[PDB]
Amino acid sequence: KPQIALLMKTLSNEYFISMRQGAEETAKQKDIDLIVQVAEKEDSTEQLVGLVENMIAKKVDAIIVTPNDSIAFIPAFQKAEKAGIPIIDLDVRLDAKAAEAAGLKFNYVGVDNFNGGYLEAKNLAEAIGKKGNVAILEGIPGVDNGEQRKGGALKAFAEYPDIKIVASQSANWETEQALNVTTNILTANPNINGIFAANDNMAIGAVTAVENAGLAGKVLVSGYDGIPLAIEYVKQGKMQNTIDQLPKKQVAIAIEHALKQINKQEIPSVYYVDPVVVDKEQSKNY
Numbered sequence: 001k002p003q004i005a006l007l008m009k010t011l012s013n014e015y016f017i018s019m020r021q022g023a024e025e026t027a028k029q030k031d032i033d034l035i036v037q038v039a040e041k042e043d044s045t046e047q048l049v050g051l052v053e054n055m056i057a058k059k060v061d062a063i064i065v066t067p068n069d070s071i072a073f074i075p076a077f078q079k080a081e082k083a084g085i086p087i088i089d090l091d092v093r094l095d096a097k098a099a100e101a102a103g104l105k106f107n108y109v110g111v112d113n114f115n116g117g118y119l120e121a122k123n124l125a126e127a128i129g130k131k132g133n134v135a136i137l138e139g140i141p142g143v144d145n146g147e148q149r150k151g152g153a154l155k156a157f158a159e160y161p162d163i164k165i166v167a168s169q170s171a172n173w174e175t176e177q178a179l180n181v182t183t184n185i186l187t188a189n190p191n192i193n194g195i196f197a198a199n200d201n202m203a204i205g206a207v208t209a210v211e212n213a214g215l216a217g218k219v220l221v222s223g224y225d226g227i228p229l230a231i232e233y234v235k236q237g238k239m240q241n242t243i244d245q246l247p248k249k250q251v252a253i254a255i256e257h258a259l260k261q262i263n264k265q266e267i268p269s270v271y272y273v274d275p276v277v278v279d280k281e282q283s284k285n286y
């Protein structure tokens with residue numbers, strides 16, 4: 001009965017709670033013994049590497065890890081290759097050029113976050129009337145997934161000359177911070193009518209601001225991940241859209257990909273699940 005480790009940067013997020021649950025359903029279905037270990041602060045890279053190497057030391061059958069740093073985990077991954085343990089890079093993608101440099105072959109599973117943001121910004125751009133002033137809420141500075149979604153958004157508003165990015169501030173993926181930041185951003189420009197948030201938590205924090213500010217219906221918010229509560233807000237109209245990243249399908253493919261590599265079959269180096277744009281008429285399905 002093969003023993004697989006899932007090593008996660010956090011569980012404080014609802015999104016990962018969702019992925020962990022889907023992970024355990026796939027584990028049960030495929031008769032896998034599944035070992036979940038979570039890092040303590042979301043941003044502590046060292047401790048997570050700590051965790052990966054432990055699993056190497058325990059000679060676990062496979063490891064699925066959601067990295068904490070695109071580069072820090074490379075020596076970890078090429079230690080796992082030397083211990084002949086297959087290993088799947090989930091969610092956050094390791095630096096390709098850096099991986100190239102060190103002779104490392106590694107396998108990712110996720111989504112195009114650039115595309116996801118492009119698709120997500122584009123929908124809100126259209127929603128606020130191809131016109132207005134937008135403000136971007138970003139994740140923890142540096143993380144690829146966050147910046148990718150930003151670059152994605154930026155490309156999209158660049159297509160609407162009557163939409164101008166007037167505010168961009170990091171809310172670090174936390175609801176409570178995005179409420180603070182959004183409030184301070186809404187006072188700063190009263191001509192803001194649309195809010196792009198790079199995850200579902202900051203979108204929720206951003207909606208609470210506009211409704212606090214008596215601005216419901218007058219500023220439209222987009223999010224990213226597709227968590228239940230975001231989806232509900234989309235139903236009620238409190239949100240314009242979120243992008244369902246399919247976190248269960250992702251980690252399902254991760255576990256499916258580990259198993260193949262345990263049985264010495266080839267997997268793609270990259271696998272991008274196809275995200276869904278979730279707005280009120282696609283909301284009918286959620």
Ligand SMILES: OC[C@H]1O[C@@H](O)[C@H](O)[C@H](O)[C@@H]1O
Nearest residue numbers: 013015091145173199224225
């Ligand atoms: O932890 C905040 C976010 O981290 C990203 O890497 C994931 O794609 C999810 O959007 C998650 O919600």
